[PDB]
Design a protein around this ligand. Structure first.
Ligand SMILES: CCN(CC)C(=O)[C@@H]1C=C2c3cccc4[nH]cc(c34)C[C@H]2N(C)C1
Lengths: 224, 331, 50, 228, 245
């Protein structure tokens, strides 16, 4: 009822199935990450250790866990069509320049755009606030005022210079407020402060990835 | 000058509108409820399927997925003829040559890679990698074994000579990313749908936009030609499908329901053209009586959204693919 | 803007046909090819490859 | 693409010899691999090994006494022969075959190594006189109809020119192998088949063999010579 | 308790939520639905007739009772051990889970369940007094009870004590505290509903007092097969919706 040639075709298909399964088994080992920073972020230099026009890719390992980080270079402001692809990533890495206040409102708007996308609903964001040294020297100089650009800083309660701590906590608090407003708990924001040169950012990425995986596992096992 | 001629075009199309298609089609027997069942489910893709294309022979199809592999299936026997490793996991389009010798792939790498399926030495190898698009390739379609058209997120469509590896013609009218493309049956002209909410008719030889159609609130994800070639249907995140007529230059019909909020991922026409099949983000595909704009059936067997939809050249079967990584054949 | 008016002028003058005639042509095609279509009218199981 | 066969020479009866064919220029792992010719008589199929070595078949005469193996990393196929008999004297050919939808099995044949020690396919004519530029028709018949319910009819035509290995001309009674001119055409009904050569030229002249691939064992007709 | 068991498990079998860990809960809900229709209702007849057994099926009934009871206990032990690795080092647990462990886990908890209760009908069906009636169809093998209830409960209990102590140690952020409360309820109910029967079973080997104690504690053990569907599933928002529909 099946000819010899059709039987050989079936054997070929089964061998192909075997090789595809092996390749998927390889694929599950890797954890996949998406990097997003508008400009002035220093997003390329976040992960110091380890470093194709359409997509820029880097591989880094900490504690024998392999991570892939994706940056999509050429695209314009509207990312809604290509961002649909990156809905299975473990986490999104969002880089913001805390030093520049004119950029900050646009960065908050872009963070809201990342946060509220339909396809990115289940994906946690690891938020790196960048160039904290630049921010610290600027606040110590005092020439510029966050109070001017943001009215809320002018009257704000601090929760290292104390003015520096106050400014940095306000800058964090706006982003965590946009993250917290949803409140669903399916996805959460991990806020961090990063110097221009920091030995450990892969460690921070790894521990937030472990937290993300732990939470998905707790939901999966019906524990919480 | 721009406003005056635009109003003149509005008057010209409005002058022609003596009747609606609903009025002409009103006294016709309905197609009735159409029931189709998944005769075959093709499995072996371990990630989300984005694109598929039927072969002209009607037995062979190609599919593209995020796991980074292009697999060609014998539909009748559910057997994988080939599985092709891809350099870039990110692929949003695939095509099958009319002669069946070649398949094409495009993605976020902005390169259209063409594969020679039939070779001495018995492997699938890259015939060409076509560069010259500054944005991601959303759609690729073959004129011949030498010529391929592509649409891209850089808001331009191009015609390529594969042997030379260069763009013979460039089509540049759109103000937004071009999501979809459909070649005419005669192949002398083609249409593209784009994120500027307009569809343009392109004459492939001259390289000019003959006509531009605007009826959609939002981006047009999908486009298909009516089998005659004098009309086409566009799918959108407006959740409406609209049938456009080339000669009349205006929208004949719109296919929508209040229940349907979701965007149309794909569209295709049945062989006669009576049936318009559309794929949605609601994880289901609705079958529309294209003449009357009455829903005639629903195809629901997918766990996740349907990324692609295709109808066989002979017209026997409909193949759908979805992000649940199973693509099913319906008859 | 100069390029736009040239295209709008080309699109401005085109031969156009009545919507009733175009709809009649579409109906003519669909009724002519209704029998050929397998999906519209279910093909018998012997003829069905699937 | 090349297949080169090694081993051979005289073996006293009851002895054992190994023949190997080395594969160059093709994906040897993908191809299923196989055929011998007696010194002046027709072809006969010895053994088959599938891709990945999963499936093995032997003809009844050789089975229990011949063993076929492939070393995929080394790109070599072996035939281990024991207790060799005077029947086994022949020229052993190493053949490549790939099976998928639309594939052409038996396309490439090695040169072959000399050794010196059931559907019934019949070719009616031993020889045919030909004129150059004159059309010729060759006919073959099977005991059982080669048409299968999938719709393919598994008939294959081969050409062995003088002092050359066989070359596939037609696969499955109508399709034409790559690198073959359009002059050859295959017309056939179930159980009754023919190959038509039109505008015959020099180098079209040789013994033509008709093979069935409907079921194992694979059987060749004795074949028809063409003579100028 | 029989109606509750059957109605609780046949509502979990349909709801299957096709995860590699949720399918294992169907194998647990199949070991209890069978316990609730084959073994349990037979004991209701024995209660009605006052310990008199209506004769060669007595050894078969005990075989099923030990089989499904041990299949249930090690389902919970496998869940507890799996739940600890998923909480201690979640990164290395997700890498080594390709939907073959779950099928390899169902094999392990049913090989030991069927391997521990295999002495009952192979040596005890020929003898009508070893695993057999004292006039009441009891399990009178005094040396198999000691060692056959040791590897069936107390080894799964010392495994659960260390697994529970280690999991709570590694879980110490409300979601982590909500999970810590679910583990406590799950661990407390398994101990309080199965341990009372097993201390009485082994301490025994006044007869009337112990005969009454073992009678009620058996049905407390059965009642845990009605609860296992609920405490292991109903904490999920999806399961609550699924039961209502
Ligand atoms: C009143 C008579 N019945 C009912 C058939 C029993 O004694 C059952 C005997 C059991 C028993 C013995 C020895 C080892 C074991 N492991 C697990 C069980 C077990 C289950 C346990 N069931 C609940 C009671």
């Amino acid at each position: 009822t099946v000819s010899a040639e059709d039987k050989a075709a079936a054997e070929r298909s089964k061998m192909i199935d075997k090789n595809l399964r092996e390749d998927g088994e390889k694929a599950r080992r890797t954890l996949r990450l998406l990097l997003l920073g508008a400009d002035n972020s220093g997003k390329s230099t976040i992960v110091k250790q380890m470093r194709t026009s359409g997509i820029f890719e880097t591989k880094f390992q900490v504690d024998k866990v392999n991570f892939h980080m994706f940056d999509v270079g050429g695209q314009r402001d509207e990312r809604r069509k290509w961002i649909q692809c990156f809905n299975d990533v473990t986490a999104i890495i969002f880089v913001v320049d805390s030093s520049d206040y004119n950029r900050l409102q646009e960065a908050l708007n872009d963070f809201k755009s990342i946060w509220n996308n339909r396809w990115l609903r289940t994906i946690s964001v690891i938020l790196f606030l960048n160039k904290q040294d630049l921010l610290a020297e600027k606040v110590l100089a005092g020439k510029s005022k966050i109070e001017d650009y943001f009215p809320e800083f002018a009257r704000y309660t601090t929760p290292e210079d104390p003015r520096v701590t106050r400014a940095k906590y306000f800058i964090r608090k706006e982003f965590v407020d946009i993250s917290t407003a949803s409140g669903d708990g399916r996805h959460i924001c991990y806020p961090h402060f990063t110097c221009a040169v920091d030995t450990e950012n892969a460690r921070r990425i790894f521990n937030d990835c472990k937290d993300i995986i732990l939470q998905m596992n707790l939901r999966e096992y019906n524990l919480v | 000058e721009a406003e005056q001629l635009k109003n003149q075009i509005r008057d010209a199309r409005k002058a022609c509108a003596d009747a609606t298609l609903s009025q002409i089609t009103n006294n016709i027997d309905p197609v009735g409820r159409i029931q189709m069942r998944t005769r075959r489910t093709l499995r072996g893709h371990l990630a989300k399927i984005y694109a598929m294309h039927w072969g002209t022979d009607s037995r062979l199809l190609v599919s593209a997925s995020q796991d980074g592999k292009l697999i060609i299936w014998d539909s009748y026997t559910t057997n994988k003829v080939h599985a092709i490793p891809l350099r870039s996991s990110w692929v949003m389009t695939c095509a099958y040559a009319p002669s069946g010798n070649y398949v094409a792939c495009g993605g976020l790498d902005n390169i259209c890679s063409i594969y020679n399926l039939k070779t001495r030495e018995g492997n699938v190898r890259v015939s060409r990698e076509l560069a010259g698009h500054t944005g991601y390739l959303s759609c690729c379609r073959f004129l011949d074994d030498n010529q391929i058209v592509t649409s891209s997120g850089d808001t331009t469509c191009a015609l390529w000579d594969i042997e030379t590896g260069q763009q013979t013609t460039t089509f540049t009218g759109h103000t937004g990313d071009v999501m979809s493309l459909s070649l005419a049956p005669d192949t002398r002209l083609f249409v593209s749908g784009a994120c500027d909410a307009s569809a343009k008719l392109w004459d492939v030889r001259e390289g000019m936009c003959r006509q531009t159609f605007t009826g959609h609130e939002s981006d047009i994800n999908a486009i298909c030609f009516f089998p005659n070639g004098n009309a086409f249907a566009t799918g959108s995140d407006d959740a409406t499908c609209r049938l456009f007529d080339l000669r009349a230059d205006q929208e004949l019909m719109t296919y929508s329901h209040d229940n349907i909020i979701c965007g149309i991922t794909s569209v295709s026409f049945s062989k006669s053209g009576r049936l318009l099949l559309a794929g949605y983000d609601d994880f289901n595909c609705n079958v529309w009586d294209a003449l009357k704009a009455d829903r005639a059936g629903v195809l629901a067997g997918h766990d996740n959204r349907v990324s692609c939809l295709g109808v066989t050249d002979d017209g026997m079967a409909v193949a759908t693919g979805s992000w649940d990584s199973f693509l099913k054949i319906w008859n | 803007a100069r390029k736009l008016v040239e295209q709008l002028k080309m699109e401005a003058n085109i031969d156009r046909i009545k919507v009733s005639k175009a709809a009649a042509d579409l109906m003519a095609y669909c009724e002519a090819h209704a029998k050929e279509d397998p999906l519209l009218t279910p093909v018998p199981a012997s003829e069905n490859p699937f | 693409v090349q297949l080169v066969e090694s081993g051979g020479g005289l073996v006293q009866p009851g002895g054992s010899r190994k023949l190997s064919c080395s594969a160059s220029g093709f994906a040897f792992s993908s191809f299923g691999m196989h055929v011998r010719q007696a010194p002046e008589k027709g072809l006969e199929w010895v053994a088959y090994i599938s891709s990945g070595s999963g499936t093995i078949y032997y003809a009844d005469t050789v089975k229990g006494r011949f063993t076929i193996s492939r070393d995929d990393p080394k790109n070599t196929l072996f035939l281990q022969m024991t207790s060799l008999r005077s029947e086994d004297t022949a020229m052993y050919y190493c053949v490549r075959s790939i099976y998928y939808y639309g594939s052409s099995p038996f396309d490439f044949w090695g040169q072959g190594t000399t050794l010196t020690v059931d559907i019934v396919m019949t070719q009616a004519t031993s020889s045919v006189p030909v004129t150059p530029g004159e059309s010729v028709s060759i006919s073959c018949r099977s005991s059982k109809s080669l048409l299968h319910s999938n719709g393919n009819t598994y008939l294959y035509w081969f050409l062995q020119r003088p002092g050359q290995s066989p070359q596939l001309l037609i696969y499955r009674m109508s399709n034409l192998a790559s690198g073959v001119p359009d002059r050859f055409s295959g017309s056939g009904s179930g159980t009754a088949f023919t190959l038509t050569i039109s505008r015959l030229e020099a180098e079209d002249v040789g013994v033509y063999y008709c093979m069935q691939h409907l079921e194992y064992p694979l059987t060749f007709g004795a074949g028809t010579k063409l003579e100028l | 308790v029989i109606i509750l068991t059957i109605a609780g498990n046949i509502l979990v079998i349909m709801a299957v939520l096709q995860n590699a860990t949720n399918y294992f809960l169907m194998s647990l809900a199949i070991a209890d639905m069978l316990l609730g229709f084959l073994v349990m209702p037979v004991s209701m007849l024995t209660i009605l007739y006052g310990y008199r057994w209506p004769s060669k099926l007595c050894a078969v009934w005990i075989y099923l009772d030990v089989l499904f009871s041990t299949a249930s206990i090690m389902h919970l032990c496998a869940i507890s051990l799996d739940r600890y690795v998923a909480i201690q080092n979640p990164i290395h647990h997700s890498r080594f889970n390709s939907r073959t462990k779950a099928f390899l886990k169902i094999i392990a908890v049913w090989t030991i369940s069927v391997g521990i209760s295999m002495p009952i009908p192979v040596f005890g069906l020929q003898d009508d007094s070893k695993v057999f009636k004292e006039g009441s169809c009891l399990l009178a093998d005094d040396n198999f009870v000691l060692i056959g209830s040791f590897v069936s409960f107390f080894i799964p209990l010392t495994i659960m004590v260390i697994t529970y102590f280690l999991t709570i140690k590694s879980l110490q952020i409300s979601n982590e505290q909500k999970a810590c409360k679910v583990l406590g309820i799950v661990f407390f109910l398994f101990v309080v509903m199965w341990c009372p029967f097993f201390i009485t079973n082994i301490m025994a080997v006044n007869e009337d007092v112990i005969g009454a104690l073992l009678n009620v504690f058996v049905w407390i053990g059965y009642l845990s097969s009605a609860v296992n569907p609920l405490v292991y599933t109903l904490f999920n928002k999806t399961y609550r919706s699924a039961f209502s529909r």
